[PDB]
Amino acid sequence: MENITSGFLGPLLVLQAGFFLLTRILTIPQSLDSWWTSLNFLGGTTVCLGQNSQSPI
Amino acid sequence: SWLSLLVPFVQWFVGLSPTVWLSVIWMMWYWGPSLYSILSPFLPLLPIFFCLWVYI
Amino acid sequence: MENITSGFLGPLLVLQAGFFLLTRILTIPQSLDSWWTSLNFLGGTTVCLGQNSQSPISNHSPTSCPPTCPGYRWMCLRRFIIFLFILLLCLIFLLVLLDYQGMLPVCPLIPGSSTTSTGPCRTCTTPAQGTSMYPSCCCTKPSDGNCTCIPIPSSWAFGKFLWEWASARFSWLSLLVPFVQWFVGLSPTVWLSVIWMMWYWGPSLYSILSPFLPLLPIFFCLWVYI
Amino acid sequence: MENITSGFLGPLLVLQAGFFLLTRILTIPQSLDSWWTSLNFLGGTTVCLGQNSQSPISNHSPTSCPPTCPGYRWMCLRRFIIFLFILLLCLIFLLVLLDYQGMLPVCPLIPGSSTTSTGPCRTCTTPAQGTSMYPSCCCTKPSDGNCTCIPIPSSWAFGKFLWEWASARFSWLSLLVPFVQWFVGLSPTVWLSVIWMMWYWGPSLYSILSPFLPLLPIFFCLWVYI
Amino acid sequence: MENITSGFLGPLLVLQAGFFLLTRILTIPQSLDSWWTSLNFLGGTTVCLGQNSQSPISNHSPTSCPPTCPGYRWMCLRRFIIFLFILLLCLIFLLVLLDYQGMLPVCPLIPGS
């Protein structure tokens, strides 16, 4: 509106608006990853594949 | 329209030879995890408004 | 009612942007601390061995050693020093980016005879003092009135003139520049192989060459005598 | 002997001086490990993370617990990174020293009617869009125009000219020149006070402002609406 | 814009926009609560006041008894009082801001020619 016309926030506004869409898209990737993980789990669960003791985790 | 501008960007960059894709494939992949982890400090996309004012 | 909604939406976006900017600024010290810890430790402990048990002795002392143990203290001083170092470092990148824009100036003044002008010279420069060096070109020569020197080149600009000027101080480096030309003359599909071989053997090559240091001076003396 | 002795010793003296320089460089690496520990002094002591139970050795400071085998790629990589940072710092220091020299021209541009000496304008009229950083001013214009332009003026102001060039981008920052001037005045007393104050401030003023940090955006937005 | 004119989201849009401001204001209350807690701590820390064993909770710290641990009702009352105080303070600050606006007069009087 008036503030948009009277300010240079437009580039920052675009960066922020795309940030929300980028976050949603990135969540879509992890969400699909979890969905497939459950699918392959097929009524099951698992640990990280190479979760070896040679790691402080 | 900026997508059309990036189309020439892809034309000149992606339109490279096998001698460039070969380097970009494997060695970049090895640094790719490290590069992604480093880019995490720039995950706030500060360079985004950076080049935004660059255009400004 | 329509006008109020737009202002409310704009203020919320402004607040979110400010919060994101502050979070990024703070995480810059956090990311720097994480990188420094990874470099120093590379598989070490981060319990902040400088932590103290005079307060809750839970191992919550981060790389920043939160709060009590150092905390708002020597650890915070290190964090602020790292932030200042980062602010200094980004200035170099900003300067390089601004320089390679062609707003940047590279007005050079070195001894030469290259000519590109319209109906030039026939008076030229006759300076028999101050060697061959040239001063600011308002009119460099002691008696030059119609003088015109050389304009900044779009290519390189800052750095190229300094390189040329310093090549006089160390001509051997200028002579050795042929090796740099050969290395640049190497094909693009050679850097990866060079790095891989260097990474594979560079530690071993340095270790083996460290004992070889005495052998090199004898060969150098023989070559000098020859 | 004499010259023949000098000629023979040229290689020997070269080897000796090169080994002294290599000792200085290794100290630069050893001292770099020292500042790495100083950063780790926030964390604490200097136990080796790279040293492991394999290759039976003792424990020492982070640089030299069986460094080569135990340090392996991690210690070498950290040393190389520190050496690169040190070289970058040396380059920055050299650039600053060359900047303060004033041999380098800034070769700037600004609109004005001033002249260092007797300069006849002869109706100097040819303007252009973006008067700052105009054409080379080798009388590059629709005609010659009887042009006289700026030489590289004598001041540690090569960066000052760049700032003036970029000053137009943000007028508010230039408007803060009054606070800059006030900071310029009484700086030794200001330094003498803020050295202790900021140390005290760094301890608790940041913590105090932390609650105020979220409050600032709301008030700033409220004022901007006006 | 066009979507706003062609949709009834305006009420929902207002509800969502006020939600962000309400969240920021509520955070301001808890943020001030933490700030004062540190101030009273005065380079210290503490546990939740009435954090007694007659509650299936761990060692809550200060403003950590949410609504069932200990006298969380009293903690909530203190939070509400602090929120009212912060509201009064920010209202006073806003009044002081507009004070130098010049729209308001002082409408004073003094003897002179």
XYZ file of C-alpha atoms in Angstrom:
678
model
C 0.000 0.000 0.000
C 1.230 3.482 0.897
C 4.061 2.072 3.019
C 5.116 -0.220 0.165
C 5.230 2.733 -2.231
C 7.094 4.863 0.344
C 9.617 2.206 1.360
C 12.320 0.038 -0.155
C 11.168 -3.007 1.845
C 9.950 -4.544 -1.424
C 13.151 -6.550 -1.933
C 13.149 -7.585 1.724
C 9.405 -8.216 1.440
C 10.018 -10.568 -1.490
C 12.840 -12.294 0.398
C 10.579 -12.829 3.416
C 7.576 -13.977 1.373
C 9.702 -16.492 -0.514
C 11.147 -17.637 2.807
C 7.747 -18.941 3.930
C 7.186 -20.759 0.634
C 10.728 -22.143 0.746
C 10.140 -23.390 4.295
C 6.871 -25.034 3.248
C 8.559 -26.711 0.273
C 11.460 -27.928 2.421
C 8.987 -29.303 4.965
C 7.209 -31.078 2.094
C 10.507 -32.894 1.400
C 11.008 -33.999 5.008
C 7.298 -34.797 5.347
C 7.440 -37.041 2.283
C 10.643 -38.583 3.629
C 8.868 -39.458 6.873
C 5.835 -40.731 4.955
C 7.970 -43.086 2.842
C 9.953 -44.076 5.945
C 6.714 -45.207 7.570
C 5.686 -46.894 4.315
C 8.915 -48.894 4.107
C 8.680 -49.475 7.855
C 5.312 -51.028 6.957
C 3.908 -51.038 10.451
C 7.391 -50.873 11.938
C 10.312 -48.691 13.012
C 14.098 -48.609 12.711
C 17.263 -46.798 13.761
C 19.559 -44.715 11.592
C 21.189 -46.981 9.023
C 24.895 -46.585 9.738
C 24.384 -45.376 13.311
C 27.642 -46.892 14.531
C 29.365 -46.410 17.875
C 32.253 -44.585 16.143
C 30.272 -41.355 16.465
C 29.389 -39.246 19.525
C 25.657 -39.671 18.885
C 10.369 -12.689 -16.944
C 13.389 -13.276 -14.691
C 12.968 -16.965 -15.524
C 13.570 -16.062 -19.170
C 16.701 -14.187 -18.091
C 17.881 -17.264 -16.187
C 17.187 -19.282 -19.346
C 20.157 -17.552 -21.042
C 22.055 -18.123 -17.794
C 21.409 -21.857 -18.119
C 22.237 -21.632 -21.826
C 25.724 -20.275 -21.181
C 26.465 -22.164 -17.945
C 24.769 -25.559 -18.306
C 25.690 -25.461 -21.994
C 29.195 -26.584 -21.056
C 31.397 -29.488 -22.161
C 32.003 -32.896 -20.560
C 35.323 -31.529 -19.251
C 33.313 -29.227 -16.941
C 30.451 -31.497 -15.876
C 32.998 -34.164 -14.927
C 34.654 -31.777 -12.476
C 31.304 -30.460 -11.235
C 29.895 -33.941 -10.572
C 32.190 -35.777 -8.178
C 34.547 -33.311 -6.486
C 31.673 -30.909 -5.844
C 29.665 -33.784 -4.355
C 32.457 -34.557 -1.888
C 32.476 -30.918 -0.806
C 28.691 -30.891 -1.266
C 27.873 -32.011 2.285
C 30.436 -29.606 3.715
C 29.210 -26.864 1.381
C 25.617 -27.465 2.483
C 26.640 -27.366 6.145
C 28.520 -24.100 5.609
C 25.623 -22.568 3.631
C 23.612 -23.270 6.839
C 25.190 -20.085 8.318
C 23.636 -18.325 5.267
C 20.366 -20.331 5.603
C 18.857 -16.992 6.796
C 19.313 -16.007 3.096
C 21.024 -12.718 4.117
C 22.840 -12.795 0.720
C 19.274 -12.694 -0.741
C 18.600 -9.102 0.390
C 22.331 -8.634 -0.283
C 21.919 -9.043 -4.094
C 18.441 -7.462 -3.798
C 20.130 -4.161 -2.830
C 22.840 -5.096 -5.374
C 20.109 -4.711 -8.034
C 18.665 -1.686 -6.148
C -11.759 -1.427 7.485
C -9.750 -2.253 4.371
C -7.010 0.276 5.166
C -6.422 -1.081 8.680
C -5.939 -4.641 7.409
C -3.161 -3.620 5.009
C -1.294 -1.747 7.735
C -1.679 -4.665 10.137
C -0.357 -7.092 7.518
C 2.585 -4.838 6.683
C 3.570 -4.401 10.322
C 3.512 -8.169 10.869
C 5.810 -8.714 7.888
C 8.135 -5.969 9.146
C 8.265 -7.574 12.595
C 8.973 -11.006 11.110
C 11.739 -9.561 8.925
C 13.323 -7.787 11.885
C 13.163 -10.952 13.977
C 14.779 -12.930 11.158
C 17.516 -10.310 10.765
C 18.275 -10.337 14.492
C 18.275 -14.142 14.544
C 20.682 -14.253 11.599
C 22.976 -11.682 13.217
C 23.038 -13.705 16.438
C 23.536 -17.018 14.622
C 26.505 -15.508 12.788
C 28.413 -15.602 16.105
C 26.841 -19.017 16.723
C 27.850 -20.350 13.305
C 31.339 -18.910 13.752
C 31.611 -20.605 17.149
C 30.447 -23.912 15.672
C 32.995 -23.677 12.859
C 35.789 -22.732 15.267
C 34.900 -25.624 17.572
C 34.868 -28.034 14.633
C 38.260 -26.757 13.466
C 39.825 -26.893 16.934
C 38.213 -30.139 18.089
C 37.519 -32.126 14.897
C 36.223 -34.868 17.173
C 36.727 -33.328 20.603
C 34.726 -32.415 23.671
C 32.658 -29.236 23.952
C 31.868 -29.374 27.690
C 33.862 -26.134 28.062
C 36.539 -27.486 30.398
C 36.764 -23.925 31.730
C 33.322 -24.427 33.268
C 32.847 -24.118 37.026
C 30.844 -26.143 39.544
C 30.193 -23.245 41.952
C 26.826 -22.997 40.145
C 24.597 -25.764 38.705
C 27.306 -28.136 37.527
C 25.209 -29.613 34.734
C 27.308 -29.835 31.584
C 25.398 -27.008 29.897
C 28.550 -24.967 29.286
C 28.469 -24.728 25.477
C 31.245 -23.617 23.157
C 30.050 -20.210 24.373
C 30.144 -21.568 27.971
C 26.690 -20.219 28.845
C 26.000 -17.618 31.546
C 27.896 -18.279 34.759
C 31.108 -20.094 33.868
C 32.693 -17.389 31.691
C 29.437 -16.782 29.855
C 28.886 -13.036 30.022
C 32.661 -13.038 30.492
C 35.862 -14.238 28.766
C 33.727 -16.604 26.670
C 31.528 -13.670 25.636
C 34.697 -11.684 24.942
C 35.881 -14.451 22.615
C 32.462 -14.500 20.936
C 32.544 -10.733 20.404
C 36.109 -10.964 19.080
C 34.984 -13.625 16.603
C 32.056 -11.436 15.540
C 34.419 -8.496 15.024
C 36.758 -10.707 12.992
C 33.820 -11.792 10.824
C 32.771 -8.168 10.317
C 36.338 -7.336 9.292
C 36.514 -10.319 6.935
C 33.263 -9.535 5.113
C 34.641 -6.062 4.376
C 37.311 -7.584 2.118
C 34.699 -9.469 0.093
C 32.535 -6.348 -0.160
C 35.555 -4.348 -1.333
C 36.414 -6.959 -3.971
C 32.816 -7.034 -5.209
C 32.660 -3.239 -5.418
C 36.046 -3.104 -7.164
C 34.996 -5.536 -9.886
C 32.056 -3.339 -10.876
C 33.906 -0.803 -13.018
C 32.885 2.084 -10.852
C 36.249 1.309 -9.256
C 39.372 3.306 -10.332
C 42.793 1.972 -11.326
C 44.540 5.063 -12.795
C 48.075 3.789 -13.496
C 51.381 5.627 -13.885
C 54.381 3.543 -14.988
C 57.201 4.077 -17.528
C 56.064 3.183 -21.028
C 55.688 4.366 -24.602
C 52.326 2.928 -25.670
C 50.440 5.449 -27.804
C 46.699 5.598 -28.498
C 45.369 9.113 -29.131
C 44.462 11.630 -31.838
C 47.373 13.546 -33.345
C 49.461 13.023 -30.226
C 53.053 13.679 -29.107
C 55.613 15.778 -31.052
C 56.171 17.454 -27.668
C 55.635 14.502 -25.325
C 57.658 14.118 -22.118
C 61.329 15.075 -21.568
C 61.773 14.451 -17.787
C 65.465 13.716 -16.979
C 64.803 13.603 -13.180
C 62.976 11.251 -10.794
C 64.054 8.329 -12.992
C 61.270 6.881 -15.138
C 58.536 6.961 -12.496
C 55.495 9.090 -13.230
C 53.528 11.262 -10.828
C 49.814 12.124 -10.738
C 48.929 12.975 -14.312
C 47.615 16.510 -13.990
C 50.834 17.142 -15.965
C 53.496 14.725 -14.661
C 56.601 16.290 -16.249
C 58.161 19.351 -14.570
C 57.367 21.421 -17.680
C 54.471 19.502 -19.258
C 51.540 21.667 -20.315
C 49.800 19.697 -23.056
C 50.414 16.331 -21.358
C 47.952 13.429 -21.564
C 48.755 10.055 -20.009
C 46.828 6.765 -19.736
C 43.153 6.117 -18.680
C 42.117 3.242 -16.390
C 41.442 -0.077 -18.121
C 38.053 -1.725 -17.574
C 39.748 -5.091 -17.086
C 41.479 -5.797 -13.745
C 41.745 -2.119 -12.652
C 42.779 -2.245 -8.966
C 45.499 -4.804 -8.362
C 46.940 -5.072 -11.863
C 48.719 -1.713 -11.622
C 50.048 -2.596 -8.171
C 51.243 -5.967 -9.482
C 53.068 -4.281 -12.354
C 54.627 -1.708 -10.019
C 55.763 -4.346 -7.519
C 57.171 -6.557 -10.284
C 59.967 -3.986 -10.508
C 60.885 -4.592 -6.861
C 61.059 -8.381 -7.373
C 61.889 -9.142 -11.004
C 62.610 -12.794 -10.165
C 58.927 -13.257 -9.345
C 58.149 -11.627 -12.690
C 60.564 -14.113 -14.256
C 58.956 -16.974 -12.322
C 55.527 -15.831 -13.594
C 56.101 -18.219 -16.530
C 55.387 -21.107 -14.159
C 52.115 -19.407 -13.218
C 51.343 -19.095 -16.928
C 51.988 -22.816 -17.421
C 49.756 -23.674 -14.463
C 47.011 -21.419 -15.826
C 47.777 -22.830 -19.269
C 46.849 -26.252 -17.911
C 43.463 -27.512 -19.033
C 40.397 -27.057 -16.805
C 40.181 -30.831 -16.310
C 43.462 -30.825 -14.377
C 42.665 -28.974 -11.131
C 40.589 -31.852 -9.753
C 43.333 -34.393 -10.457
C 45.991 -32.087 -9.002
C 43.957 -31.598 -5.821
C 43.178 -35.308 -5.476
C 46.828 -36.297 -5.872
C 47.904 -33.474 -3.557
C 45.302 -34.452 -0.967
C 46.285 -38.117 -1.241
C 50.031 -37.542 -0.858
C 50.484 -33.961 0.373
C 50.937 -34.961 4.003
C 53.172 -37.892 3.057
C 54.992 -35.770 0.472
C 55.655 -33.054 3.058
C 56.808 -35.627 5.617
C 59.218 -37.263 3.164
C 60.425 -33.885 1.883
C 61.102 -32.577 5.397
C 64.135 -34.899 5.694
C 65.029 -33.976 2.102
C 65.549 -30.326 3.103
C 69.326 -30.799 3.620
C 69.705 -32.340 0.151
C 68.242 -29.318 -1.649
C 70.930 -26.782 -0.590
C 73.689 -28.959 -2.071
C 71.891 -29.088 -5.420
C 71.276 -25.333 -5.271
C 74.965 -24.664 -4.602
C 75.986 -26.983 -7.445
C 73.598 -25.248 -9.853
C 74.841 -21.809 -8.777
C 78.444 -22.915 -9.307
C 77.475 -24.457 -12.652
C 88.880 -16.043 -1.653
C 86.845 -12.926 -0.818
C 84.472 -12.764 -3.790
C 85.053 -16.453 -4.533
C 84.462 -17.097 -0.840
C 81.441 -14.789 -1.060
C 80.233 -16.590 -4.180
C 80.498 -19.972 -2.473
C 78.845 -18.682 0.712
C 76.007 -17.182 -1.324
C 74.363 -20.595 -1.489
C 75.259 -21.342 2.139
C 73.983 -17.966 3.345
C 70.885 -18.464 1.181
C 70.238 -21.822 2.848
C 70.785 -20.331 6.312
C 68.456 -17.384 5.679
C 65.840 -19.663 4.127
C 65.972 -21.924 7.168
C 65.598 -18.883 9.439
C 62.567 -17.796 7.408
C 61.170 -21.340 7.571
C 61.628 -21.230 11.343
C 59.693 -17.955 11.382
C 56.961 -19.529 9.236
C 56.728 -22.603 11.471
C 56.517 -20.267 14.461
C 53.666 -18.543 12.611
C 52.127 -22.039 12.539
C 53.130 -22.741 16.142
C 51.916 -19.293 17.193
C 48.749 -19.953 15.199
C 48.274 -23.072 17.313
C 48.899 -20.775 20.281
C 46.022 -18.480 19.343
C 43.943 -21.570 18.594
C 44.518 -22.527 22.226
C 43.720 -18.938 23.228
C 40.356 -19.318 21.511
C 40.142 -22.705 23.232
C 41.078 -20.943 26.471
C 37.395 -20.030 26.427
C 36.769 -23.774 26.394
C 39.721 -24.619 28.617
C 42.910 -26.665 28.292
C 44.636 -27.984 25.146
C 44.126 -31.753 25.166
C 44.385 -33.450 21.772
C 41.187 -34.675 20.168
C 43.104 -36.093 17.205
C 45.328 -38.200 19.445
C 43.797 -41.636 20.005
C 44.599 -44.867 21.817
C 45.903 -46.204 18.502
C 49.582 -45.605 17.720
C 50.592 -45.760 21.413
C 51.811 -42.319 22.482
C 51.368 -39.888 25.374
C 49.085 -36.859 25.680
C 50.317 -33.311 25.113
C 49.144 -29.921 23.853
C 46.677 -29.938 20.944
C 49.348 -29.230 18.327
C 51.892 -31.935 19.137
C 50.460 -35.162 20.469
C 52.344 -37.465 18.054
C 51.484 -34.910 15.363
C 51.656 -36.561 11.904
C 50.219 -39.961 12.816
C 47.813 -38.980 15.625
C 47.026 -35.528 14.272
C 46.700 -37.110 10.807
C 44.497 -35.143 8.369
C 42.705 -33.119 11.049
C 45.769 -31.432 12.554
C 47.297 -30.825 9.122
C 44.030 -29.354 7.827
C 43.697 -27.082 10.860
C 47.302 -25.942 10.432
C 46.736 -25.250 6.732
C 43.557 -23.278 7.458
C 45.358 -21.245 10.117
C 48.247 -20.612 7.717
C 45.834 -19.427 5.028
C 44.162 -17.099 7.527
C 47.570 -15.775 8.597
C 48.558 -15.153 4.978
C 45.270 -13.321 4.419
C 45.916 -11.187 7.504
C 49.418 -10.394 6.243
C 47.981 -9.384 2.869
C 45.430 -7.146 4.603
C 48.178 -5.510 6.669
C 50.271 -4.930 3.542
C 47.253 -3.412 1.788
C 46.640 -1.072 4.729
C 50.309 -0.058 4.763
C 50.205 0.681 1.033
C 46.998 2.658 1.600
C 48.627 4.883 4.220
C 51.553 5.396 1.846
C 49.596 7.583 -0.564
C 51.644 6.513 -3.572
C 48.452 4.913 -4.869
C 46.092 7.334 -6.620
C 42.398 7.208 -5.707
C 41.807 9.003 -9.030
C 38.383 10.206 -7.868
C 35.714 12.471 -9.376
C 33.327 15.059 -7.931
C 31.477 18.107 -9.343
C 33.120 21.427 -8.530
C 34.708 24.588 -9.881
C 37.934 24.312 -7.866
C 41.410 24.004 -9.371
C 44.837 23.254 -7.927
C 46.350 25.991 -10.113
C 45.556 28.464 -12.911
C 42.918 26.635 -14.928
C 41.071 28.315 -17.792
C 37.567 26.873 -18.149
C 36.951 28.309 -21.645
C 33.217 27.689 -21.170
C 33.661 24.150 -19.873
C 30.104 22.991 -20.409
C 29.816 19.368 -21.517
C 27.799 17.639 -18.762
C 26.520 14.059 -18.711
C 24.256 11.797 -16.688
C 26.080 10.746 -13.547
C 28.580 13.591 -13.257
C 30.511 11.555 -10.693
C 32.802 9.031 -12.405
C 32.270 10.619 -15.815
C 34.242 9.694 -18.962
C 38.048 9.438 -18.728
C 38.273 13.235 -19.163
C 41.116 12.991 -21.655
C 38.971 15.594 -23.410
C 36.680 12.692 -24.325
C 33.537 14.626 -25.269
C 31.705 15.930 -28.365
C 34.806 18.079 -28.861
C 38.035 18.453 -26.898
C 36.452 21.169 -24.765
C 39.752 22.480 -23.336
C 39.547 20.041 -20.447
C 41.622 19.874 -17.271
C 40.771 17.179 -14.735
C 41.839 15.767 -11.387
C 45.272 14.266 -10.736
C 45.851 11.851 -7.867
C 45.831 14.391 -4.961
C 48.137 13.798 -1.969
C 46.206 12.344 0.972
C 45.586 9.094 2.860
C 42.171 9.408 1.281
C 41.992 6.672 -1.363
C 39.287 5.081 0.778
C 37.795 8.462 1.629
C 37.108 9.049 -2.067
C 35.473 5.621 -2.307
C 33.310 6.392 0.729
C 32.271 9.707 -0.812
C 31.407 7.776 -3.973
C 29.237 5.375 -1.972
C 27.996 8.060 0.441
C 25.156 8.914 -1.949
C 23.693 5.425 -1.487
C 22.678 6.097 2.137
C 22.061 9.708 3.143
C 21.156 8.839 6.744
C 24.632 7.452 7.451
C 26.224 10.657 6.157
C 23.738 12.591 8.297
C 25.347 10.933 11.343
C 28.556 12.899 10.660
C 27.846 14.974 13.801
C 28.141 11.960 16.100
C 31.231 10.925 14.132
C 32.788 14.344 14.741
C 31.905 14.201 18.438
C 33.548 10.776 18.665
C 36.576 12.233 16.867
C 36.874 14.868 19.569
C 38.003 13.794 23.038
C 38.753 10.302 21.698
C 41.692 9.647 24.087
C 39.452 10.469 27.051
C 36.611 8.591 25.352
C 38.923 5.613 24.855
C 40.231 5.907 28.419
C 36.665 5.701 29.752
C 35.096 3.200 27.325
C 37.970 0.743 27.789
C 36.791 0.027 31.333
C 33.135 0.883 30.672
C 32.674 -1.488 27.727
C 34.385 -4.262 29.679
C 31.805 -3.660 32.392
C 29.178 -3.075 29.698
C 30.142 -6.241 27.839
C 29.426 -8.108 31.058
C 25.933 -6.838 31.797
C 24.828 -4.136 29.350
C 24.275 -6.779 26.673
C 22.178 -8.813 29.109
C 20.147 -5.728 30.016
C 19.587 -4.836 26.362
C 18.548 -8.422 25.619
C 15.112 -7.832 27.203
C 15.023 -4.468 25.434
C 15.934 -6.066 22.094
C 12.412 -7.404 21.379
C 10.935 -4.119 22.612
C 12.947 -2.031 20.140
C 11.269 -3.326 16.935
C 7.756 -2.434 18.114
C 8.684 1.141 19.025
C 10.706 1.565 15.828
C 7.725 0.402 13.767
C 5.400 2.699 15.722
C 7.590 5.727 14.999
C 7.936 4.797 11.317
C 4.150 4.933 10.964
C 4.190 8.479 12.399
C -5.873 -6.766 -3.581
C -8.120 -8.503 -6.105
C -8.290 -11.655 -3.972
C -9.216 -9.585 -0.911
C -12.033 -7.904 -2.837
C -13.179 -11.265 -4.265
C -13.022 -13.201 -0.996
C -14.494 -13.142 2.487
C -11.104 -13.933 4.064
C -11.060 -10.385 5.457
C -12.467 -11.454 8.834
C -10.119 -14.440 8.928
C -7.334 -12.164 7.677
C -7.960 -9.791 10.589
C -8.072 -12.710 13.032
C -4.738 -14.013 11.729
C -3.060 -10.594 11.653
C -4.133 -9.885 15.224
C -2.893 -13.341 16.195
C 0.701 -12.370 15.383
C 0.426 -9.118 17.342
C -1.240 -10.952 20.231
C 1.573 -13.517 20.238
C 4.188 -10.751 20.239
C 2.440 -8.972 23.118
C 2.133 -12.201 25.117
C 5.822 -12.912 24.518
C 6.576 -9.381 25.752
C 4.911 -10.363 29.055
C 6.924 -13.568 29.467
C 10.080 -11.820 28.242
C 9.658 -9.094 30.858
C 8.918 -11.775 33.450
C 12.206 -13.492 32.624
C 14.032 -10.152 32.613
C 12.757 -9.272 36.101
C 13.436 -12.842 37.253
C 17.074 -12.397 36.266
C 17.073 -8.946 37.877
C 15.792 -10.285 41.199
C 18.107 -13.269 40.776
C 20.816 -10.584 40.619
C 23.513 -12.791 39.193
C 21.748 -15.901 40.452
C 19.103 -18.557 39.821
C 16.292 -20.309 41.680
C 13.663 -23.039 41.486
C 9.906 -22.618 41.321
C 8.709 -21.095 44.582
C 6.288 -23.692 45.920
C 7.763 -26.554 43.889
C 6.910 -29.158 46.512
C 7.109 -32.936 46.242
C 3.294 -33.173 46.493
C 3.119 -32.706 42.723
C 4.123 -35.023 39.857
C 6.614 -32.473 38.515
C 10.380 -32.072 38.381
C 12.381 -29.187 39.868
C 10.664 -26.292 38.124
C 12.642 -23.050 38.086
C 11.027 -19.669 38.929
C 8.364 -18.920 36.311
C 8.154 -22.605 35.425
C 5.067 -23.809 37.300
C 2.668 -23.575 34.344
C -0.793 -23.952 35.893
C -0.779 -27.100 38.012
C 2.688 -27.236 39.589
C 2.754 -25.584 43.054
C 1.177 -22.164 43.430
C 1.239 -21.685 39.669
C -2.031 -19.801 40.138
C -0.036 -17.289 42.167
C 2.727 -17.390 39.556
C 0.051 -16.695 36.949
C -1.331 -13.862 39.086
C 2.137 -12.334 39.336
C 2.491 -12.690 35.569
C -0.854 -10.939 35.064
C 0.141 -8.117 37.413
C 3.433 -7.712 35.553
C 1.533 -7.694 32.259
C -0.768 -4.945 33.521
C 2.270 -2.973 34.684
C 3.924 -3.390 31.278
C 0.706 -2.271 29.593
C 0.632 0.859 31.745
C 4.318 1.503 31.039
C 3.941 1.182 27.270
C 0.811 3.341 27.329
C 2.781 6.015 29.190
C 5.609 5.675 26.667
C 3.182 6.091 23.762
C 1.660 9.154 25.423
C 5.131 10.641 25.919
C 5.968 9.946 22.253
C 2.851 11.815 20.977
C 3.622 14.460 23.667
C 6.229 16.092 21.347
C 3.937 15.808 18.301
C 2.794 19.409 18.604
C -0.813 18.553 17.770
C -1.636 18.991 21.447
C -1.301 22.516 22.749
C 0.110 23.491 26.147
C -2.216 26.516 25.898
C -0.170 28.411 28.495
C -0.325 31.935 29.937
C 2.309 34.464 31.009
C 2.391 38.281 31.379
C 4.059 40.080 28.488
C 3.687 42.614 25.698
